[PDB]
Design goal:
monomer, alpha/beta, TIM Barrel, six-stranded antiparallel β-sheet, 10 helices, 15 strands, binds a molecule of 3 linked components (NAG-NAG-NAG), hydrolase
């Protein structure tokens, strides 16, 4: 199994103990590290942060401490939107400009592959023809990577993609059978399945449907989404399950109504380190759980929630990560990906569960290991 760990290049700006840079990563925990995010200018890949070159070197230097580790660079993300991708895929000239720039960029800075994170082809302003043009981009990039590997006598650069977990976005965005032939791995974003945008409480990454969910609401769980990909053309071995190391917050419209589906008024307050209303990192959640919160196990969905007065949290913990790791192995998927390693309790100071409790849970559950001693 693979354990793919996203690192974000804005985590460095979090105050105090929240600040996270590549040297904070334990190089032995994951099999792959993905750097989020690169950008695009004139149809060529580019940096986005003033010190990305510094962080790239620290990131890829981690491989000097773990000879099995591979790294990838992710391009796009939510805030990046779709317009640059649409323009870039619109013509063969623009796709060639981009692919050529990626090969040079990844080889220059020491990456082993590119993770495409277009959110999403066919949606958020992207026109309908981008569903097929995304397939064409991926096909041409895989082919260019295969040729560069042979021409440079190096292992081939990987091409992966982070893909939607919402059924409407999946249907609008991806030609799953053909896309699956050319991608090395498919990182399915099985999180953000509920959130304050819906006007009621729900879990971020429930494994199973809630018993009274009907219609499209019954799609909003890891089981349905992973099996949708699997049964519409993607090989299980290429499918990677998304694991969030954060939770979503809500303000309850009525504190006594604090179950799944309780009505809500909006996002919960920003955390002191992540400073974005609507979510908390796992280490921030641990502080919340020590501040008087009530913890509840959502038994049907195999995830926890918690609440305190008018604040409600749907999240993941060691137990839910363990249950879902067991599940993905039984279903023969390729492994797990984590959004994001800088949201774990990387210092060990917040949760009293050791360093990197959630990521370590998956490392153990998936049997990640590179140090063999040849004796008891
Ligand atoms: C408004 C909203 O919640 N939209 C959801 C998108 O966030 C999500 O996109 C992917 O998931 C993660 C986690 O949500 C995204 O991380 C966000 O990245 C932006 C920069 O682009 C940063 O400003 C946010 O702080 C950060 N949020 C968190 C909790 O870390 C990430 O960009 C996207 N890529 C990956 C691999 O996860 C999509 C997933 O389908 O759902 C929307 O509902």
């Amino acid at each position: 199994y693979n354990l793919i760990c996203y690192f974000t290049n804005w985590a460095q700006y979090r105050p105090g103990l929240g600040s996270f840079k590549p040297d904070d990563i334990n190089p032995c925990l994951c099999t792959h590290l993905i750097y989020a995010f690169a950008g695009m200018q004139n149809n060529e890949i580019t940096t986005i942060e003033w010190n990305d070159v510094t962080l790239y070197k620290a990131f890829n230097d981690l491989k000097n401490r773990n000879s099995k580790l591979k790294t990838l660079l992710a391009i796009g993300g939510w805030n990046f939107g779709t317009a640059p991708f649409t323009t870039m895929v619109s013509t063969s000239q623009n796709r060639q400009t981009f692919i050529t720039s990626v090969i040079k960029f990844l080889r220059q800075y020491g990456f082993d592959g590119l993770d495409l994170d277009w959110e999403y082809p066919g949606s958020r302003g992207s026109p309908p023809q981008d569903k097929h043009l995304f397939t064409v981009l991926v096909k041409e990039m895989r082919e260019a990577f295969e040729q560069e590997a042979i021409e440079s006598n190096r292992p081939r650069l990987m091409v992966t993609a982070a893909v939607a977990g919402g059924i409407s976005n999946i249907q609008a965005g991806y030609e799953i059978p053909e896309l699956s032939k050319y991608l090395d791995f498919i990182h399915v974003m099985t999180y953000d399945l509920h959130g304050s945008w819906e006007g009621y409480t729900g879990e971020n990454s429930p494994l199973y449907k809630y018993p009274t969910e009907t219609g499209s609401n019954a799609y909003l769980n890891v089981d349905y989404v992973m099996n949708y990909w699997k049964n519409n053309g993607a090989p299980a071995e290429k499918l990677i399950v998304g694991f969030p190391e954060y939770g979503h917050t809500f303000i309850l419209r009525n504190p006594s109504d604090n179950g799944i589906g309780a009505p809500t008024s909006g996002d919960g307050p920003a955390g002191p380190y992540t400073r974005q209303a609507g979510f908390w990192a796992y280490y921030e959640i641990c502080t919340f759980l020590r501040s008087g919160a009530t913890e509840v196990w959502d038994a049907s969905q195999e995830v926890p929630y918690a609440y305190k007065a008018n604040e409600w949290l749907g999240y993941d913990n060691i137990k839910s990560f363990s249950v879902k790791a067991q599940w993905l192995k039984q279903n023969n998927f390729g492994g797990a990906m984590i959004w994001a390693i800088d949201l774990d309790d990387f210092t060990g100071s917040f949760c009293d569960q050791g360093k990197f409790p959630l990521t370590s849970t998956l490392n153990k559950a998936l049997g990640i290991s590179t140090h063999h001693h040849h004796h008891h």
